[PDB]
Amino acid sequence: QGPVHLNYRQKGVIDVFLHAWKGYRKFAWGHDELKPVSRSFSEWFGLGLTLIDALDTMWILGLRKEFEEARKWVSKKLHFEKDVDVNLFESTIRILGGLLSAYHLSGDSLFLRKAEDFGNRLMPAFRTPSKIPYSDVNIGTGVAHPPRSDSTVAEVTSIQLEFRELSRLTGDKKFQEAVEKVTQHIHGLSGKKDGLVPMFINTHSGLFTHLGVFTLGARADSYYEYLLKQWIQGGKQETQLLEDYVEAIEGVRTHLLRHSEPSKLTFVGELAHGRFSAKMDHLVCFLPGTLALGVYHGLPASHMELAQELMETCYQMNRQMETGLSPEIVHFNLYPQPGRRDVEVKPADRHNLLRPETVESLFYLYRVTGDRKYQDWGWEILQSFSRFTRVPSGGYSSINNVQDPQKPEPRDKMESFFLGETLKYLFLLFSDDPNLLSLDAYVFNTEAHPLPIWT
Ligand SMILES: O=C1N[C@@H]2[C@@H](O)[C@@H](O)[C@H](O)[C@@H](CO)N2C1=O
Ligand SMILES: [Ca+2]
């Protein structure tokens, strides 16, 4: 049984969370990720990733009993004295961000203590000549190093909210100073295309690499997101961040924005040495949300028009599929041809890993416009998750074929961001309380962990 006050859609999200958590608790407790189909688990860093990523979601959904049990695990089983290499970015947005939000929501100092411990262990990654951090760092030995080879731009520019907040709470300025150094370096770095940034950067030279190739998908997405979010977090005082964000959006309009045929769906493609590619990762669906968030905070009304158009397109990326779930990547038709549909998907990209981007943006579009249809769209997507990704014994799994409702083909994996992001954004989307994690008081990191806006 669940709280009587909850509207039916939030109640529904809770039901889904509980079924998902049932699987985690039974077959992967304390492990990074659940393997629902095989009733097993998988380890990435060995730091209870799914548990930490879901802490704030449990608190927000009112699952206090579950939260307490998870809190106990953090207190007794989470140890950073381990010989393991972690990705600075992935561990920052999930672990550091997740512990920080858990700390703020619960008021439990345990989470802050663990966050400060982890933050210190990540610092060796910034020990480079350019000060642009290495991609990986061994939290136990203290040695940092690049991938098995430069660092990716999104990775070094999407850890700022977390490190800035850790400094604010601890009084230890080294975290903030380290990440702000990278932000400042990126700002004056050449190699950009009207605000658009390359996907990689060399830690030794500190220069952009893989020049002339731009995308807002994997390897770059959150860079644009954090320009705006840092500005918001800092109390809208850091004009350079705002300016870079505004320039970037214009760069998007000028180089990556196109429309499909015959429906004229607005979308963002990729550019490689002058050649446009009508390819759009689902990851890019974070944009309408970020755009709307900006509008709420005073950005151009043109950003809102773009946000609504892209939200519609992202919704269609889901609804045009037989399962109602968007695939990993979607290609759009640019030229006139009758009978030719707008959305196309390659056989290799028909997987759905329970990603949050569409529901994330629906949350922002609803909060800013108050248009109930965005809630309706989110409810439809949740129905699809329940119908095609549910694992009877517990949990939900990524699927290989979004186009076959009879045989979706589970991949036997529940990404940590399903409980950390996807279900949190849906719960919030269904709330009709603008004061629940208000856009005026909190800013979500890129893994859906809310952090307080500074005064
Ligand atoms: O490329 C990725 N960027 C996103 C992240 O910003 C975050 O949302 C999840 O880690 C996950 C969600 O879809 N991320 C990716 O795999
Ligand atoms: Ca994200």
PDB file of all heavy atoms in Angstrom, residues 87-93 96 122 125-126 133-134 153-165 175 178-180 182-183 222 226 230 445-446:
ATOM      1  N   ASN A  87      35.983   6.159 -13.722  1.00  0.00           N
ATOM      2  CA  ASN A  87      35.977   7.255 -14.677  1.00  0.00           C
ATOM      3  C   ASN A  87      35.592   8.478 -13.849  1.00  0.00           C
ATOM      4  O   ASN A  87      34.587   8.457 -13.138  1.00  0.00           O
ATOM      5  CB  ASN A  87      34.942   6.984 -15.771  1.00  0.00           C
ATOM      6  CG  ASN A  87      34.850   8.109 -16.779  1.00  0.00           C
ATOM      7  OD1 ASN A  87      34.096   9.070 -16.594  1.00  0.00           O
ATOM      8  ND2 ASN A  87      35.629   8.003 -17.856  1.00  0.00           N
ATOM      9  N   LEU A  88      36.401   9.533 -13.922  1.00  0.00           N
ATOM     10  CA  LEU A  88      36.131  10.745 -13.156  1.00  0.00           C
ATOM     11  C   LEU A  88      34.702  11.241 -13.359  1.00  0.00           C
ATOM     12  O   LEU A  88      33.964  11.461 -12.395  1.00  0.00           O
ATOM     13  CB  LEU A  88      37.115  11.851 -13.551  1.00  0.00           C
ATOM     14  CG  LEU A  88      36.866  13.221 -12.913  1.00  0.00           C
ATOM     15  CD1 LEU A  88      37.026  13.112 -11.400  1.00  0.00           C
ATOM     16  CD2 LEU A  88      37.830  14.246 -13.492  1.00  0.00           C
ATOM     17  N   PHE A  89      34.315  11.411 -14.614  1.00  0.00           N
ATOM     18  CA  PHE A  89      32.981  11.898 -14.952  1.00  0.00           C
ATOM     19  C   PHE A  89      31.840  11.008 -14.473  1.00  0.00           C
ATOM     20  O   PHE A  89      30.950  11.473 -13.758  1.00  0.00           O
ATOM     21  CB  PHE A  89      32.889  12.130 -16.471  1.00  0.00           C
ATOM     22  CG  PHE A  89      31.480  12.185 -17.008  1.00  0.00           C
ATOM     23  CD1 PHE A  89      30.706  13.330 -16.861  1.00  0.00           C
ATOM     24  CD2 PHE A  89      30.939  11.094 -17.682  1.00  0.00           C
ATOM     25  CE1 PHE A  89      29.412  13.392 -17.386  1.00  0.00           C
ATOM     26  CE2 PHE A  89      29.647  11.146 -18.209  1.00  0.00           C
ATOM     27  CZ  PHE A  89      28.882  12.300 -18.060  1.00  0.00           C
ATOM     28  N   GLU A  90      31.871   9.731 -14.849  1.00  0.00           N
ATOM     29  CA  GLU A  90      30.817   8.799 -14.465  1.00  0.00           C
ATOM     30  C   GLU A  90      30.649   8.669 -12.950  1.00  0.00           C
ATOM     31  O   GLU A  90      29.524   8.574 -12.448  1.00  0.00           O
ATOM     32  CB  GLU A  90      31.086   7.414 -15.070  1.00  0.00           C
ATOM     33  CG  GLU A  90      31.169   7.372 -16.599  1.00  0.00           C
ATOM     34  CD  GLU A  90      29.832   7.632 -17.292  1.00  0.00           C
ATOM     35  OE1 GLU A  90      28.780   7.570 -16.625  1.00  0.00           O
ATOM     36  OE2 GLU A  90      29.833   7.885 -18.516  1.00  0.00           O
ATOM     37  N   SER A  91      31.759   8.663 -12.218  1.00  0.00           N
ATOM     38  CA  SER A  91      31.690   8.534 -10.770  1.00  0.00           C
ATOM     39  C   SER A  91      31.285   9.846 -10.118  1.00  0.00           C
ATOM     40  O   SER A  91      30.698   9.848  -9.039  1.00  0.00           O
ATOM     41  CB  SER A  91      33.030   8.042 -10.216  1.00  0.00           C
ATOM     42  OG  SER A  91      34.058   8.969 -10.465  1.00  0.00           O
ATOM     43  N   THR A  92      31.598  10.968 -10.766  1.00  0.00           N
ATOM     44  CA  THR A  92      31.228  12.266 -10.220  1.00  0.00           C
ATOM     45  C   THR A  92      29.726  12.505 -10.321  1.00  0.00           C
ATOM     46  O   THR A  92      29.083  12.870  -9.334  1.00  0.00           O
ATOM     47  CB  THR A  92      31.951  13.423 -10.946  1.00  0.00           C
ATOM     48  OG1 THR A  92      33.347  13.365 -10.637  1.00  0.00           O
ATOM     49  CG2 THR A  92      31.395  14.784 -10.499  1.00  0.00           C
ATOM     50  N   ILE A  93      29.158  12.294 -11.501  1.00  0.00           N
ATOM     51  CA  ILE A  93      27.733  12.537 -11.684  1.00  0.00           C
ATOM     52  C   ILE A  93      26.850  11.537 -10.952  1.00  0.00           C
ATOM     53  O   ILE A  93      25.745  11.877 -10.543  1.00  0.00           O
ATOM     54  CB  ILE A  93      27.336  12.561 -13.186  1.00  0.00           C
ATOM     55  CG1 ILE A  93      27.516  11.173 -13.812  1.00  0.00           C
ATOM     56  CG2 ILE A  93      28.163  13.607 -13.914  1.00  0.00           C
ATOM     57  CD1 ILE A  93      27.036  11.093 -15.270  1.00  0.00           C
ATOM     58  N   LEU A  96      29.277  11.082  -6.498  1.00  0.00           N
ATOM     59  CA  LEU A  96      29.396  12.347  -5.779  1.00  0.00           C
ATOM     60  C   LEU A  96      28.065  13.095  -5.825  1.00  0.00           C
ATOM     61  O   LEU A  96      27.582  13.586  -4.806  1.00  0.00           O
ATOM     62  CB  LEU A  96      30.524  13.205  -6.367  1.00  0.00           C
ATOM     63  CG  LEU A  96      30.779  14.526  -5.638  1.00  0.00           C
ATOM     64  CD1 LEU A  96      30.982  14.263  -4.137  1.00  0.00           C
ATOM     65  CD2 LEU A  96      32.000  15.207  -6.220  1.00  0.00           C
ATOM     66  N   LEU A 122      39.315  11.691  -5.877  1.00  0.00           N
ATOM     67  CA  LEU A 122      39.222  11.984  -7.308  1.00  0.00           C
ATOM     68  C   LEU A 122      40.207  13.062  -7.754  1.00  0.00           C
ATOM     69  O   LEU A 122      40.600  13.116  -8.923  1.00  0.00           O
ATOM     70  CB  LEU A 122      37.802  12.433  -7.666  1.00  0.00           C
ATOM     71  CG  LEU A 122      36.652  11.432  -7.515  1.00  0.00           C
ATOM     72  CD1 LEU A 122      35.329  12.158  -7.702  1.00  0.00           C
ATOM     73  CD2 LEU A 122      36.794  10.296  -8.535  1.00  0.00           C
ATOM     74  N   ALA A 125      43.211  13.265 -10.420  1.00  0.00           N
ATOM     75  CA  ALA A 125      42.939  13.299 -11.858  1.00  0.00           C
ATOM     76  C   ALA A 125      43.295  14.640 -12.498  1.00  0.00           C
ATOM     77  O   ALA A 125      43.535  14.714 -13.704  1.00  0.00           O
ATOM     78  CB  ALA A 125      41.464  12.974 -12.122  1.00  0.00           C
ATOM     79  N   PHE A 126      43.329  15.703 -11.700  1.00  0.00           N
ATOM     80  CA  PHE A 126      43.644  17.026 -12.230  1.00  0.00           C
ATOM     81  C   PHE A 126      45.142  17.313 -12.295  1.00  0.00           C
ATOM     82  O   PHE A 126      45.551  18.406 -12.694  1.00  0.00           O
ATOM     83  CB  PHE A 126      42.965  18.121 -11.397  1.00  0.00           C
ATOM     84  CG  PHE A 126      41.466  17.989 -11.312  1.00  0.00           C
ATOM     85  CD1 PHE A 126      40.878  17.183 -10.343  1.00  0.00           C
ATOM     86  CD2 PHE A 126      40.645  18.674 -12.204  1.00  0.00           C
ATOM     87  CE1 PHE A 126      39.492  17.067 -10.255  1.00  0.00           C
ATOM     88  CE2 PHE A 126      39.255  18.565 -12.126  1.00  0.00           C
ATOM     89  CZ  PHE A 126      38.682  17.760 -11.151  1.00  0.00           C
ATOM     90  N   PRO A 133      41.766  17.532 -16.456  1.00  0.00           N
ATOM     91  CA  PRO A 133      41.885  16.206 -15.837  1.00  0.00           C
ATOM     92  C   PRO A 133      41.914  14.968 -16.719  1.00  0.00           C
ATOM     93  O   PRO A 133      41.336  14.942 -17.801  1.00  0.00           O
ATOM     94  CB  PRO A 133      40.696  16.182 -14.884  1.00  0.00           C
ATOM     95  CG  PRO A 133      39.654  16.904 -15.682  1.00  0.00           C
ATOM     96  CD  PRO A 133      40.426  18.102 -16.220  1.00  0.00           C
ATOM     97  N   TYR A 134      42.588  13.934 -16.221  1.00  0.00           N
ATOM     98  CA  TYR A 134      42.668  12.647 -16.893  1.00  0.00           C
ATOM     99  C   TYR A 134      41.272  12.030 -16.814  1.00  0.00           C
ATOM    100  O   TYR A 134      40.489  12.364 -15.919  1.00  0.00           O
ATOM    101  CB  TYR A 134      43.643  11.708 -16.181  1.00  0.00           C
ATOM    102  CG  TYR A 134      45.104  12.027 -16.382  1.00  0.00           C
ATOM    103  CD1 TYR A 134      45.905  12.408 -15.304  1.00  0.00           C
ATOM    104  CD2 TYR A 134      45.704  11.912 -17.631  1.00  0.00           C
ATOM    105  CE1 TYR A 134      47.265  12.661 -15.473  1.00  0.00           C
ATOM    106  CE2 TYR A 134      47.065  12.163 -17.810  1.00  0.00           C
ATOM    107  CZ  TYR A 134      47.835  12.534 -16.729  1.00  0.00           C
ATOM    108  OH  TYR A 134      49.179  12.780 -16.898  1.00  0.00           O
ATOM    109  N   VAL A 153      35.374  16.037 -24.000  1.00  0.00           N
ATOM    110  CA  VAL A 153      34.958  17.353 -23.544  1.00  0.00           C
ATOM    111  C   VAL A 153      33.798  17.333 -22.549  1.00  0.00           C
ATOM    112  O   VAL A 153      33.847  18.022 -21.527  1.00  0.00           O
ATOM    113  CB  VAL A 153      34.607  18.251 -24.750  1.00  0.00           C
ATOM    114  CG1 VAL A 153      34.165  19.626 -24.283  1.00  0.00           C
ATOM    115  CG2 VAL A 153      35.836  18.378 -25.651  1.00  0.00           C
ATOM    116  N   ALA A 154      32.767  16.542 -22.823  1.00  0.00           N
ATOM    117  CA  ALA A 154      31.629  16.481 -21.906  1.00  0.00           C
ATOM    118  C   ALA A 154      32.088  15.994 -20.533  1.00  0.00           C
ATOM    119  O   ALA A 154      31.638  16.489 -19.496  1.00  0.00           O
ATOM    120  CB  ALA A 154      30.549  15.554 -22.462  1.00  0.00           C
ATOM    121  N   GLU A 155      32.999  15.029 -20.520  1.00  0.00           N
ATOM    122  CA  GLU A 155      33.481  14.487 -19.259  1.00  0.00           C
ATOM    123  C   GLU A 155      34.197  15.478 -18.344  1.00  0.00           C
ATOM    124  O   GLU A 155      34.005  15.443 -17.129  1.00  0.00           O
ATOM    125  CB  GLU A 155      34.375  13.272 -19.517  1.00  0.00           C
ATOM    126  CG  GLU A 155      33.564  12.035 -19.849  1.00  0.00           C
ATOM    127  CD  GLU A 155      34.403  10.790 -20.000  1.00  0.00           C
ATOM    128  OE1 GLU A 155      35.530  10.751 -19.451  1.00  0.00           O
ATOM    129  OE2 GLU A 155      33.929   9.845 -20.665  1.00  0.00           O
ATOM    130  N   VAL A 156      34.998  16.370 -18.911  1.00  0.00           N
ATOM    131  CA  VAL A 156      35.721  17.331 -18.084  1.00  0.00           C
ATOM    132  C   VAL A 156      34.936  18.602 -17.780  1.00  0.00           C
ATOM    133  O   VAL A 156      35.313  19.373 -16.892  1.00  0.00           O
ATOM    134  CB  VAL A 156      37.082  17.715 -18.730  1.00  0.00           C
ATOM    135  CG1 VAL A 156      37.847  16.457 -19.096  1.00  0.00           C
ATOM    136  CG2 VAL A 156      36.867  18.595 -19.948  1.00  0.00           C
ATOM    137  N   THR A 157      33.837  18.815 -18.500  1.00  0.00           N
ATOM    138  CA  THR A 157      33.020  20.001 -18.306  1.00  0.00           C
ATOM    139  C   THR A 157      31.670  19.677 -17.679  1.00  0.00           C
ATOM    140  O   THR A 157      30.798  20.538 -17.592  1.00  0.00           O
ATOM    141  CB  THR A 157      32.785  20.738 -19.646  1.00  0.00           C
ATOM    142  OG1 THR A 157      32.114  19.863 -20.562  1.00  0.00           O
ATOM    143  CG2 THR A 157      34.116  21.171 -20.254  1.00  0.00           C
ATOM    144  N   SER A 158      31.503  18.432 -17.237  1.00  0.00           N
ATOM    145  CA  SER A 158      30.240  18.022 -16.633  1.00  0.00           C
ATOM    146  C   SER A 158      30.430  17.462 -15.228  1.00  0.00           C
ATOM    147  O   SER A 158      29.751  16.518 -14.824  1.00  0.00           O
ATOM    148  CB  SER A 158      29.557  16.984 -17.523  1.00  0.00           C
ATOM    149  OG  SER A 158      29.276  17.545 -18.792  1.00  0.00           O
ATOM    150  N   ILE A 159      31.366  18.056 -14.489  1.00  0.00           N
ATOM    151  CA  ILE A 159      31.661  17.635 -13.127  1.00  0.00           C
ATOM    152  C   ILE A 159      31.689  18.872 -12.236  1.00  0.00           C
ATOM    153  O   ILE A 159      31.941  18.782 -11.040  1.00  0.00           O
ATOM    154  CB  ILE A 159      33.049  16.932 -13.037  1.00  0.00           C
ATOM    155  CG1 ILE A 159      34.147  17.878 -13.547  1.00  0.00           C
ATOM    156  CG2 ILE A 159      33.041  15.634 -13.845  1.00  0.00           C
ATOM    157  CD1 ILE A 159      35.555  17.295 -13.477  1.00  0.00           C
ATOM    158  N   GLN A 160      31.413  20.028 -12.831  1.00  0.00           N
ATOM    159  CA  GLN A 160      31.473  21.293 -12.108  1.00  0.00           C
ATOM    160  C   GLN A 160      30.442  21.529 -11.009  1.00  0.00           C
ATOM    161  O   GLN A 160      30.794  22.000  -9.926  1.00  0.00           O
ATOM    162  CB  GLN A 160      31.435  22.456 -13.103  1.00  0.00           C
ATOM    163  CG  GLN A 160      32.792  22.758 -13.758  1.00  0.00           C
ATOM    164  CD  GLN A 160      33.305  21.637 -14.657  1.00  0.00           C
ATOM    165  OE1 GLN A 160      34.485  21.603 -15.013  1.00  0.00           O
ATOM    166  NE2 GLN A 160      32.421  20.728 -15.031  1.00  0.00           N
ATOM    167  N   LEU A 161      29.176  21.227 -11.281  1.00  0.00           N
ATOM    168  CA  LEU A 161      28.132  21.438 -10.273  1.00  0.00           C
ATOM    169  C   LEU A 161      28.462  20.698  -8.984  1.00  0.00           C
ATOM    170  O   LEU A 161      28.344  21.243  -7.882  1.00  0.00           O
ATOM    171  CB  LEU A 161      26.781  20.938 -10.780  1.00  0.00           C
ATOM    172  CG  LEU A 161      26.142  21.589 -12.007  1.00  0.00           C
ATOM    173  CD1 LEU A 161      24.811  20.897 -12.262  1.00  0.00           C
ATOM    174  CD2 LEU A 161      25.942  23.085 -11.782  1.00  0.00           C
ATOM    175  N   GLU A 162      28.875  19.448  -9.145  1.00  0.00           N
ATOM    176  CA  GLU A 162      29.198  18.568  -8.029  1.00  0.00           C
ATOM    177  C   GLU A 162      30.389  19.039  -7.212  1.00  0.00           C
ATOM    178  O   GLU A 162      30.312  19.133  -5.979  1.00  0.00           O
ATOM    179  CB  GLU A 162      29.435  17.144  -8.555  1.00  0.00           C
ATOM    180  CG  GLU A 162      28.233  16.558  -9.320  1.00  0.00           C
ATOM    181  CD  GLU A 162      28.163  16.995 -10.788  1.00  0.00           C
ATOM    182  OE1 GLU A 162      28.903  17.927 -11.184  1.00  0.00           O
ATOM    183  OE2 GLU A 162      27.359  16.405 -11.529  1.00  0.00           O
ATOM    184  N   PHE A 163      31.494  19.344  -7.886  1.00  0.00           N
ATOM    185  CA  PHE A 163      32.686  19.792  -7.177  1.00  0.00           C
ATOM    186  C   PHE A 163      32.479  21.164  -6.542  1.00  0.00           C
ATOM    187  O   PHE A 163      32.995  21.428  -5.461  1.00  0.00           O
ATOM    188  CB  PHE A 163      33.898  19.815  -8.114  1.00  0.00           C
ATOM    189  CG  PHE A 163      34.583  18.479  -8.246  1.00  0.00           C
ATOM    190  CD1 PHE A 163      33.939  17.407  -8.855  1.00  0.00           C
ATOM    191  CD2 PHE A 163      35.871  18.291  -7.747  1.00  0.00           C
ATOM    192  CE1 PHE A 163      34.562  16.158  -8.963  1.00  0.00           C
ATOM    193  CE2 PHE A 163      36.507  17.048  -7.852  1.00  0.00           C
ATOM    194  CZ  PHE A 163      35.848  15.980  -8.460  1.00  0.00           C
ATOM    195  N   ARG A 164      31.728  22.028  -7.215  1.00  0.00           N
ATOM    196  CA  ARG A 164      31.463  23.363  -6.676  1.00  0.00           C
ATOM    197  C   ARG A 164      30.656  23.238  -5.383  1.00  0.00           C
ATOM    198  O   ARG A 164      30.949  23.902  -4.386  1.00  0.00           O
ATOM    199  CB  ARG A 164      30.708  24.216  -7.705  1.00  0.00           C
ATOM    200  CG  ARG A 164      31.640  24.990  -8.640  1.00  0.00           C
ATOM    201  CD  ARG A 164      31.024  25.240 -10.006  1.00  0.00           C
ATOM    202  NE  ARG A 164      29.806  26.045 -10.012  1.00  0.00           N
ATOM    203  CZ  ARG A 164      29.752  27.353 -10.256  1.00  0.00           C
ATOM    204  NH1 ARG A 164      30.861  28.043 -10.498  1.00  0.00           N
ATOM    205  NH2 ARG A 164      28.575  27.969 -10.337  1.00  0.00           N
ATOM    206  N   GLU A 165      29.649  22.369  -5.399  1.00  0.00           N
ATOM    207  CA  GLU A 165      28.823  22.166  -4.215  1.00  0.00           C
ATOM    208  C   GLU A 165      29.611  21.535  -3.070  1.00  0.00           C
ATOM    209  O   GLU A 165      29.424  21.907  -1.913  1.00  0.00           O
ATOM    210  CB  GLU A 165      27.604  21.296  -4.559  1.00  0.00           C
ATOM    211  CG  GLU A 165      26.688  20.991  -3.368  1.00  0.00           C
ATOM    212  CD  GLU A 165      26.037  22.228  -2.758  1.00  0.00           C
ATOM    213  OE1 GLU A 165      26.214  23.352  -3.282  1.00  0.00           O
ATOM    214  OE2 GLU A 165      25.332  22.066  -1.739  1.00  0.00           O
ATOM    215  N   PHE A 175      38.258  21.704  -4.524  1.00  0.00           N
ATOM    216  CA  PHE A 175      37.363  21.050  -5.476  1.00  0.00           C
ATOM    217  C   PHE A 175      36.862  22.050  -6.506  1.00  0.00           C
ATOM    218  O   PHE A 175      36.991  21.834  -7.711  1.00  0.00           O
ATOM    219  CB  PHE A 175      36.169  20.432  -4.742  1.00  0.00           C
ATOM    220  CG  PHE A 175      36.562  19.500  -3.638  1.00  0.00           C
ATOM    221  CD1 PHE A 175      36.250  19.800  -2.315  1.00  0.00           C
ATOM    222  CD2 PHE A 175      37.262  18.331  -3.916  1.00  0.00           C
ATOM    223  CE1 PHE A 175      36.630  18.948  -1.283  1.00  0.00           C
ATOM    224  CE2 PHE A 175      37.649  17.467  -2.890  1.00  0.00           C
ATOM    225  CZ  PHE A 175      37.328  17.780  -1.566  1.00  0.00           C
ATOM    226  N   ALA A 178      39.624  23.543  -8.833  1.00  0.00           N
ATOM    227  CA  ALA A 178      40.082  22.610  -9.855  1.00  0.00           C
ATOM    228  C   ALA A 178      39.131  22.564 -11.051  1.00  0.00           C
ATOM    229  O   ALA A 178      39.563  22.668 -12.204  1.00  0.00           O
ATOM    230  CB  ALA A 178      40.230  21.212  -9.257  1.00  0.00           C
ATOM    231  N   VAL A 179      37.836  22.422 -10.791  1.00  0.00           N
ATOM    232  CA  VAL A 179      36.889  22.348 -11.893  1.00  0.00           C
ATOM    233  C   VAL A 179      36.651  23.681 -12.589  1.00  0.00           C
ATOM    234  O   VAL A 179      36.393  23.710 -13.788  1.00  0.00           O
ATOM    235  CB  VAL A 179      35.531  21.736 -11.453  1.00  0.00           C
ATOM    236  CG1 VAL A 179      35.754  20.336 -10.904  1.00  0.00           C
ATOM    237  CG2 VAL A 179      34.847  22.624 -10.428  1.00  0.00           C
ATOM    238  N   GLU A 180      36.748  24.789 -11.858  1.00  0.00           N
ATOM    239  CA  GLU A 180      36.520  26.082 -12.496  1.00  0.00           C
ATOM    240  C   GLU A 180      37.694  26.433 -13.405  1.00  0.00           C
ATOM    241  O   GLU A 180      37.558  27.228 -14.335  1.00  0.00           O
ATOM    242  CB  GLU A 180      36.291  27.180 -11.448  1.00  0.00           C
ATOM    243  CG  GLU A 180      35.068  26.926 -10.568  1.00  0.00           C
ATOM    244  CD  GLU A 180      34.625  28.143  -9.771  1.00  0.00           C
ATOM    245  OE1 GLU A 180      35.461  29.024  -9.493  1.00  0.00           O
ATOM    246  OE2 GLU A 180      33.431  28.209  -9.410  1.00  0.00           O
ATOM    247  N   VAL A 182      39.132  24.328 -15.397  1.00  0.00           N
ATOM    248  CA  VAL A 182      38.841  23.706 -16.684  1.00  0.00           C
ATOM    249  C   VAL A 182      37.790  24.514 -17.439  1.00  0.00           C
ATOM    250  O   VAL A 182      37.901  24.713 -18.645  1.00  0.00           O
ATOM    251  CB  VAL A 182      38.347  22.251 -16.526  1.00  0.00           C
ATOM    252  CG1 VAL A 182      39.224  21.498 -15.541  1.00  0.00           C
ATOM    253  CG2 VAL A 182      36.908  22.237 -16.095  1.00  0.00           C
ATOM    254  N   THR A 183      36.772  24.988 -16.720  1.00  0.00           N
ATOM    255  CA  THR A 183      35.712  25.773 -17.339  1.00  0.00           C
ATOM    256  C   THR A 183      36.290  27.024 -17.982  1.00  0.00           C
ATOM    257  O   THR A 183      35.928  27.389 -19.097  1.00  0.00           O
ATOM    258  CB  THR A 183      34.653  26.199 -16.307  1.00  0.00           C
ATOM    259  OG1 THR A 183      34.071  25.030 -15.720  1.00  0.00           O
ATOM    260  CG2 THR A 183      33.559  27.031 -16.969  1.00  0.00           C
ATOM    261  N   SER A 222      26.233  16.937 -22.147  1.00  0.00           N
ATOM    262  CA  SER A 222      26.208  17.712 -20.912  1.00  0.00           C
ATOM    263  C   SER A 222      27.098  18.955 -20.825  1.00  0.00           C
ATOM    264  O   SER A 222      26.965  19.749 -19.896  1.00  0.00           O
ATOM    265  CB  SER A 222      26.435  16.790 -19.701  1.00  0.00           C
ATOM    266  OG  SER A 222      27.582  15.989 -19.841  1.00  0.00           O
ATOM    267  N   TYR A 226      25.631  21.984 -18.662  1.00  0.00           N
ATOM    268  CA  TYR A 226      26.304  22.559 -17.498  1.00  0.00           C
ATOM    269  C   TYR A 226      26.697  24.028 -17.636  1.00  0.00           C
ATOM    270  O   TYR A 226      26.951  24.697 -16.638  1.00  0.00           O
ATOM    271  CB  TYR A 226      27.512  21.693 -17.105  1.00  0.00           C
ATOM    272  CG  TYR A 226      27.140  20.576 -16.136  1.00  0.00           C
ATOM    273  CD1 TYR A 226      25.881  19.970 -16.196  1.00  0.00           C
ATOM    274  CD2 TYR A 226      28.043  20.119 -15.173  1.00  0.00           C
ATOM    275  CE1 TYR A 226      25.523  18.948 -15.324  1.00  0.00           C
ATOM    276  CE2 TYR A 226      27.698  19.079 -14.290  1.00  0.00           C
ATOM    277  CZ  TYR A 226      26.436  18.503 -14.377  1.00  0.00           C
ATOM    278  OH  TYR A 226      26.074  17.467 -13.544  1.00  0.00           O
ATOM    279  N   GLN A 230      25.424  25.742 -14.354  1.00  0.00           N
ATOM    280  CA  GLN A 230      26.385  26.347 -13.437  1.00  0.00           C
ATOM    281  C   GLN A 230      25.961  27.794 -13.225  1.00  0.00           C
ATOM    282  O   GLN A 230      25.997  28.312 -12.106  1.00  0.00           O
ATOM    283  CB  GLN A 230      27.800  26.328 -14.006  1.00  0.00           C
ATOM    284  CG  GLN A 230      28.450  24.962 -14.064  1.00  0.00           C
ATOM    285  CD  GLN A 230      29.877  25.042 -14.560  1.00  0.00           C
ATOM    286  OE1 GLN A 230      30.768  25.493 -13.843  1.00  0.00           O
ATOM    287  NE2 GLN A 230      30.100  24.619 -15.796  1.00  0.00           N
ATOM    288  N   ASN A 445      21.714  17.767 -11.371  1.00  0.00           N
ATOM    289  CA  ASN A 445      22.971  17.529 -12.065  1.00  0.00           C
ATOM    290  C   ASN A 445      22.581  16.660 -13.258  1.00  0.00           C
ATOM    291  O   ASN A 445      21.395  16.370 -13.441  1.00  0.00           O
ATOM    292  CB  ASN A 445      24.050  16.904 -11.141  1.00  0.00           C
ATOM    293  CG  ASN A 445      24.040  15.387 -11.103  1.00  0.00           C
ATOM    294  OD1 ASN A 445      25.094  14.766 -10.895  1.00  0.00           O
ATOM    295  ND2 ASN A 445      22.885  14.787 -11.272  1.00  0.00           N
ATOM    296  N   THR A 446      23.542  16.251 -14.076  1.00  0.00           N
ATOM    297  CA  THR A 446      23.179  15.499 -15.268  1.00  0.00           C
ATOM    298  C   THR A 446      22.732  14.048 -15.064  1.00  0.00           C
ATOM    299  O   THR A 446      22.355  13.360 -16.021  1.00  0.00           O
ATOM    300  CB  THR A 446      24.302  15.616 -16.349  1.00  0.00           C
ATOM    301  OG1 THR A 446      23.756  15.268 -17.627  1.00  0.00           O
ATOM    302  CG2 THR A 446      25.476  14.721 -16.037  1.00  0.00           C
TER     303      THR A 446
END
